[PDB]
Structure 1
Amino acid sequence: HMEITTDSLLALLGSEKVKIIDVRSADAYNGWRMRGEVRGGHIKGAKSLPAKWLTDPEWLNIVRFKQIRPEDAIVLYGYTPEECEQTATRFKENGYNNVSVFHRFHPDWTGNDAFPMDRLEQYNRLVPAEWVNGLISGEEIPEYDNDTFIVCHAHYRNRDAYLSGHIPGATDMDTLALESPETWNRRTPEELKKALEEHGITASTTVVLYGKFMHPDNADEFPGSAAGHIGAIRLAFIMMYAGVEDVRVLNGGYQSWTDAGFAISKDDVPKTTVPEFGAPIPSRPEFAVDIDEAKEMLQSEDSDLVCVRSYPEYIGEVSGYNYIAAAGRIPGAIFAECGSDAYHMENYRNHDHTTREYHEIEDIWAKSGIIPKKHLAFYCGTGWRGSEAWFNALLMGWPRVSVYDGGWFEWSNDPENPYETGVP
């Protein structure tokens, strides 16, 4: 495989016909210093194509989806040039003949402040499996300065999602602990205080949230019981709103844990009780938007509601849920198609459920006027998908992002509220 030098790569940075491809893990790409490098993240402009994906049959369709064409001049890099060999060969097998490997990313590029790098601004909220393993093992890990933690396996009324296999030592939290199946909003501060204490969570406890994807099926009575990792990010939103200072989400959920080869447990871990949450609830109320404020945001040039639903929901063909009656949409919201239905986030995730390359998210969002200068309230049917979209914006450091908790459920439960239907 041909090589490209450091000086050559610097000179070409910003050329629209050169495709730089980072084959490290998505978490390293995001900013995690997985090998102790002084500077984490990716070379400016690089795309993410983790070499782990070579074992997946989707690899070639992913490359094409990311608009990497055989006529492109491709530059690969990893922590070492040896880490790039298989990817380069796979490219050549598929008609990509202009492929170079950059050998000096680490430590030459990472170690030199003058060479531009990018990263997810708040990457340390989105943790890799290796970090969780180190935390549970009591090993030294970066981006951690606490002495109190809990790993929480989220699910919606489905303890078997946890009992069928979970991260060792983790306890389960039903999403019903923190949100009401009546309002489908976050519970009241007094309810939240008691629920968090009964799961052993204080405001100064580092909470690591994850869920298990079990293929939600719209035919089923409770498809959300299979969308465990959406549920985990939904609980992350509620905990951050409530006042847990250090909340992490395991990138890709349970899948990332087993893909790393770490041990699986089926023990029903007893919950510990803490006497006091230790902070006022909510400590970050600005993360949550309710319907009066959502109506105000529809009237402002400074702000927008962002509808994170599927297309059949958006045009009022279906409600999307077997527990929401009305089908339609909120007038004036910006459509941000989630994926296929109410329980999937394909447009925001990779095939392995890790978050989609954040540059692609910000690019698609920008085309619809979803941009960080606005106060944005993401929403969906009841707030699950909206919480995951919100979390992605939070990770990018966007300063004014919220979840309109009530969503379409609350909006349409009031017959006075106007709505739209059909293709716009």
Structure 2
Amino acid sequence: HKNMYDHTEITTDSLLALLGSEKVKIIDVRSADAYNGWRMRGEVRGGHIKGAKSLPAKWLTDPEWLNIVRFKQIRPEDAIVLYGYTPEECEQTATRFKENGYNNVSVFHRFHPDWTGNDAFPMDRLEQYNRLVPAEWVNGLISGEEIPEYDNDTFIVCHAHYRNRDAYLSGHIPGATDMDTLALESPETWNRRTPEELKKALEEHGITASTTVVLYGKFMHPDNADEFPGSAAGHIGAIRLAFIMMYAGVEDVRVLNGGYQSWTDAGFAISKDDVPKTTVPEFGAPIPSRPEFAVDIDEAKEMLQSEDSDLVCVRSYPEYIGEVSGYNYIKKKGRIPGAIFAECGSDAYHMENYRNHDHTTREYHEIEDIWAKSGIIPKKHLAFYSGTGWRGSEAWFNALLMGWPRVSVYDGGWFEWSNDPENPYETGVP
């Protein structure tokens, strides 16, 4: 009696008995930030039912919704169990599954407060979720309102871009100041700048080591035909800057999940003011305070020879096999021998394998399980890298968020490696 609009309820007891079943898919339709652990309705335990997959109901407007579902391996032969903060928030998702040929769809009504409120009901969360902030958190922050996971009295919202002030001037978070990516990294090496330059640059942008820095960027459809495609990949640049600031010693760095798009999707006010900087005289800590976050070429070579270490290549497949360099300023094509490949996505300016279509980070369990299939696991010292370290920093950040204890960015990347003609490299399909 398949009813597209009337959905079977599943009880708490029934769901608890199915937690280990391989043919049940439990689907969390709340925002990815709530899934990660943010207690968006004041629940005492945040996160998701253990084993649940993330499928935010916001994505129902995506024309590729069904391909998102299929790529998550959610199949018509599965028993689908949907939950959100309320069963009403699941109704449109339940219908969309039934309209696309899924005949076994139930809704679980008692996730909150029944499941969240009882410590015998298993839940999971992204261990360092408080570094990956939702738009509502940033809005409360700049509004001077009490927000969770924030006990500081000093903050700065920083809009990152690579030589493209228009990315900021065309629309930004109220009160934010822009930080060009060249302020923290050198155009000669495309590595992080020296400690003296970083100190000066951070001070001139109004940042101290005890300032809470909220970083975001704007995705503006990077095109390889342009001279600087990176000028349109603002949110990768933001995570790259988060890497450098955390290396330098900013103790509390946050990243807005999904970048500028999350802010406008949440309906918040846009500003076009060119906000002047409020400089500070003293950064307030030795730079770098966290040198272990950065790996340079000599240590990278050692890691290729150690059993407990790996370099992780976060480049595209055409870069991997030496078909393209990836960049209009890199001539050499190939790959570092001995690195573990973790395909970023389609090219140097897209991170589709680490992101959702709305640019929020991919469900971390999926990233975790793919990495584990290649032997990328938390018990190793891992140095993520890419062409010059932007994509590598975004991979690194994702592992940092899972609480992995020895993750780093090999800053130099393929740019530095291939610039020494004495360094071995491989090419072609392996």
TM-score bracket, normalised by the shorter chain, equals over 0.9
Q: CA deviation at 1:302?
A: 0.3
CA–CA distance in 2 between the matches of 1:311 and 1:89?
A: 37
CA–CA distance in 1 between the matches of 2:423 and 2:68?
A: 42
Which piece of structure 1 moves more, 296-305 or 52-61?
52-61
Q: Which of 367, 371, 374 is matched with 1:368 structurally?
A: 374
Q: CA deviation at 1:313?
A: 0.7
CA–CA distance in 2 between the matches of 1:300 and 1:137?
A: 49
Q: Which of 26, 29, 34 is matched with 1:28 structurally?
A: 34
**What do residues 262-283 of structure 1 show as CA deviations (whole Å, max 9, x unaligned)?**
0111110000100000000000
**What do residues 168-220 of structure 1 show as CA deviations (whole Å, max 9, x unaligned)?**
10000000000001010000000000000000000000000000000111110
Q: CA deviation at 1:418?
A: 0.7
**What do residues 9-51 of structure 1 show as CA deviations (whole Å, max 9, x unaligned)?**
1111111000000000000000000000000000000000000
Divergent runs of 4+, >6 A:
none
The corresponding residue for 2:424 is 418
**What do residues 250-303 of structure 1 show as CA deviations (whole Å, max 9, x unaligned)?**
000000000000011111000010000000000000000000000000001100
Which piece of structure 1 moves more, 344-353 or 314-323?
314-323
Query: Secondary structure at the residue paired with 1:261?
Result: coil
Coordinate RMSD, CA, aligned: 0.6
Q: CA deviation at 1:228?
A: 0.2
Q: CA deviation at 1:221?
A: 0.3
CA–CA distance in 1 between the matches of 2:426 and 2:94?
A: 50
Which piece of structure 1 moves more, 215-224 or 63-72?
63-72
**What do residues 302-321 of structure 1 show as CA deviations (whole Å, max 9, x unaligned)?**
00000000011111111110
Q: CA deviation at 1:57?
A: 1.0
Query: Secondary structure at the residue paired with 2:405?
Result: coil
> What TM-score results when the alignment is normalised by the length of structure 1?
0.99
Query: Secondary structure at the residue paired with 2:106?
Result: strand
Query: Secondary structure at the residue paired with 1:225?
Result: helix
CA–CA distance in 1 between the matches of 2:230 and 2:98?
A: 42
Query: Secondary structure at the residue paired with 2:202?
Result: helix
Over the matched positions of the two proteins, sequence identity in percent amounts to 99
CA–CA distance in 1 between the matches of 2:331 and 2:114?
A: 59
CA–CA distance in 2 between the matches of 1:312 and 1:92?
A: 38
Q: CA deviation at 1:59?
A: 1.1
Q: CA deviation at 1:332?
A: 0.4
Q: Which runs of 5+ in 2 are unaligned?
A: 1-6
Query: Secondary structure at the residue paired with 1:172?
Result: strand
The corresponding residue for 1:10 is 16
Q: CA deviation at 1:55?
A: 1.5
CA–CA distance in 2 between the matches of 1:320 and 1:92?
A: 42
CA–CA distance in 1 between the matches of 2:100 and 2:226?
A: 41
Q: CA deviation at 1:65?
A: 1.1
Q: CA deviation at 1:154?
A: 0.2
Q: Which runs of 5+ in 1 are unaligned?
A: none
Query: Secondary structure at the residue paired with 2:139?
Result: helix
> What TM-score results when the alignment is normalised by the length of structure 2?
0.98
Which piece of structure 1 moves more, 267-276 or 90-99?
90-99
Q: CA deviation at 1:69?
A: 1.2
CA–CA distance in 1 between the matches of 2:312 and 2:97?
A: 38
Query: Secondary structure at the residue paired with 2:69?
Result: helix
Q: CA deviation at 1:363?
A: 0.7
Which piece of structure 1 moves more, 86-95 or 260-269?
86-95
The size of the alignment, in residue pairs, is: 424
Q: CA deviation at 1:138?
A: 0.7
CA–CA distance in 1 between the matches of 2:71 and 2:338?
A: 30
Query: Secondary structure at the residue paired with 2:189?
Result: coil
The corresponding residue for 1:146 is 152
**What do residues 93-132 of structure 1 show as CA deviations (whole Å, max 9, x unaligned)?**
1111211111110011111111110000000000000000
Q: Which of 395, 401, 407 is matched with 2:401 structurally?
A: 395
The corresponding residue for 1:244 is 250
**What do residues 141-185 of structure 1 show as CA deviations (whole Å, max 9, x unaligned)?**
000000100000000000000000000100000000000010100
